[PDB]
Amino acid sequence: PAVGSVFLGGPFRQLVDPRTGVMSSGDQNVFSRLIEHFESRGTTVYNAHRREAWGAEFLSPAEATRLDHDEIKAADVFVAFPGVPASPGTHVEIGWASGMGKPMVLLLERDEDYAFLVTGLESQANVEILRFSGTEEIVERLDGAVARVLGR
Amino acid sequence: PAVGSVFLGGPFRQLVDPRTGVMSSGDQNVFSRLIEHFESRGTTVYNAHRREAWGAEFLSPAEATRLDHDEIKAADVFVAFPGVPASPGTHVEIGWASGMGKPMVLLLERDEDYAFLVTGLESQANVEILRFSGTEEIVERLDGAVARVLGR
Secondary structure, three states: OOOOEEEEEOOOHHHEEOOOOEEOHHHHHHHHHHHHHHHOOOOEEEEHHHHOHHHOOOOOHHHHHHHHHHHHHHOOEEEEOOOOOOOHHHHHHHHHHHHHOOOEEEEEEOOOOOOHHHHOOOOOOOEEEEEEOOHHHHHHHHHHHHHHHHOO | OOOOEEEEEOOOHHHEEOOOOEEOHHHHHHHHHHHHHHHOOOOEEEEHHHHOHHHOOOOOHHHHHHHHHHHHHHOOEEEEOOOOOOOHHHHHHHHHHHHHOOOEEEEEEOOOOOOHHHHOOOOOOOEEEEEEOOHHHHHHHHHHHHHHHHOO
């Protein structure tokens, strides 16, 4: 495959309905669709949401931190939704990735406000910002952003 | 001084009263007191809150990102409140600092829940977590945490 591996990040705990103990199937659908987008080409995807049963089976904080950091480091590209409101864990990961010089694509909801230390990464780290209004738009544009950051 | 420089981080935008355009004086007081704690010993403090007029004068996202990253890198120690709710920018910085192997002290409100990728850094990065119930407790314990992480 052109892309050997990706780490896919995004809000996790805040998407977990504490009445159900998992993420809704609509939220799971966004991630599983992007995962399939990559796996269908033989690209390895690392992703905590799928890894931890969509919220049913959280790892310990030490374990989550270790695996997330290791897999971001191993992956060729880091692709993440910073989240609205902001995902604390994903923002730590954005720090790890940008501080490491990891190629990254940030998926930002169109017309939503994101942190200065997220949007300010554009053309200062190896990052591309992809603004979107639906899942289909992400699916249709993501490979371009990925290829551009990988090429740098 | 024992500590040459510190970067002090914490929630910024979320503390900015959009009716007043700045942080309240109570919130400014927490930071100015910690700044004085270090400056009174000749330690250089970098801090975006004081730098940007407590919210009155935000830099551009690119500028904030560049200065924050540069000053965290220059500082001997990174001291930050991750915030409740989480500060997006501070979480990016926590990523930068931990990914860099920067000595760090995280100031966490006692009995509040923080992200797994924050608390999970304990004994996996050069970090000490300082739980607190008031400003005075931070002031009274901070040098110990700082000295321990610097010594590693």
